[PDB]
């Protein structure tokens, strides 16, 4: 019990690799039949990362309803997230169809299009406001409205238009640019400053559909974002913050999508992020301003 005393115990013993390997062994295993179907081979970026049949997002089309995406429904925390892979050149239309149908207002991107000299995600959004994107297959139009660039992250305002229904919606795009694959952010302050920017925007509100969170596979960096956010919500509605066990919350999350959190250091980071973030949730308003200064966003 209690995360802060548990953190110091594991760091002194140097057993982060053992604690993480135990979570992998205890992790749920459910079928991924639709994902392994031959017609869906080119819809998957990686052969080892597939959504479970029970929690997969279904597209609203009679042809093929598949997309490598999962709905993580956290009952007690009262929040849902959609974790998906970085879209492929042939799945960008499917990605935006999912955003429309699920009524999402925000998209959280934790990777870069090109990392370590390799293509990790397609350029699914327009880089220029005069060069809008039309997805002919799903009959959707996407235009860049504005962008607010900071040192380690970018916030974009996009307009998604359904051409069949003639309706328009504003989508907020939160892009973390300095988080390496299988790595961790620069500091808990830089991560939390980003997380609270997403919270204050109104994208995570239950009035809207689930927030779309992705990276390259949508399991490592994405699992870290969602684990830290869910743990902070729980210690605000329980009235006993010390009862929150990060390992039990991660195992509950892994019931909806395989491999959430990829390394031992990513789990260690989730602990640091929640411990530091608990200060604001507890009632100390001033630490949010301290995170902005230590993140060096200017």
């Amino acid at each position: 019990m209690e995360m802060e005393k548990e953190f110091e115990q594991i760091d002194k013993s140097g057993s982060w690799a053992a604690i993480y390997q135990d979570i992998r062994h205890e992790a749920s295993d459910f079928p991924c039949r639709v994902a392994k179907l031959p017609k869906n081979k080119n819809r998957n970026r990686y052969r080892d990362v597939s959504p479970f049949d029970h929690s997969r997002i279904k597209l609203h089309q009679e042809d093929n309803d598949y997309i490598n995406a999962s709905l993580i429904k956290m009952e007690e925390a009262q929040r849902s997230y959609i974790l998906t892979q970085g879209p492929l050149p042939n799945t960008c239309g499917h990605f935006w169809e999912m955003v429309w149908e699920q009524k999402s207002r925000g998209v959280v991107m934790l990777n870069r299009v090109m990392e370590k000299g390799s293509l990790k995600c397609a350029q699914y959004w327009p880089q220029k406001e005069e060069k809008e994107m039309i997805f002919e297959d799903t009959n959707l139009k996407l235009t860049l409205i504005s962008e607010d660039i900071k040192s380690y992250y970018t916030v974009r305002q996009l307009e998604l238009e359904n051409l069949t229904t003639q309706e328009t919606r504003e989508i907020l795009h939160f892009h973390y640019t300095t988080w390496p694959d299988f790595g961790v952010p620069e500091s808990p302050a830089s991560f939390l400053n980003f997380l609270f920017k997403v919270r204050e925007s109104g994208s995570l509100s239950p009035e809207h559909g689930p927030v779309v969170v992705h990276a390259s596979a949508g399991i490592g960096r994405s699992g870290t974002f969602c684990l830290a956010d869910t743990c902070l919500l729980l210690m605000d509605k329980r009235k006993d913050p010390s009862s929150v066990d990060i390992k039990k919350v991660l195992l509950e999350m892994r019931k909806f999508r395989m491999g959430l959190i990829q390394t031992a250091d990513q789990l260690r980071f989730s602990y640091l992020a929640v411990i530091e973030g608990a200060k604001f949730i507890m009632g100390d308003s001033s630490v949010q301003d301290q995170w902005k200064e230590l993140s060096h966003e200017d």
Partner: peptide, 5 residues
């Protein structure tokens, strides 16, 4: 196909 891990 490729593999992530």
């Amino acid at each position: 196909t490729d593999y992530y891990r």
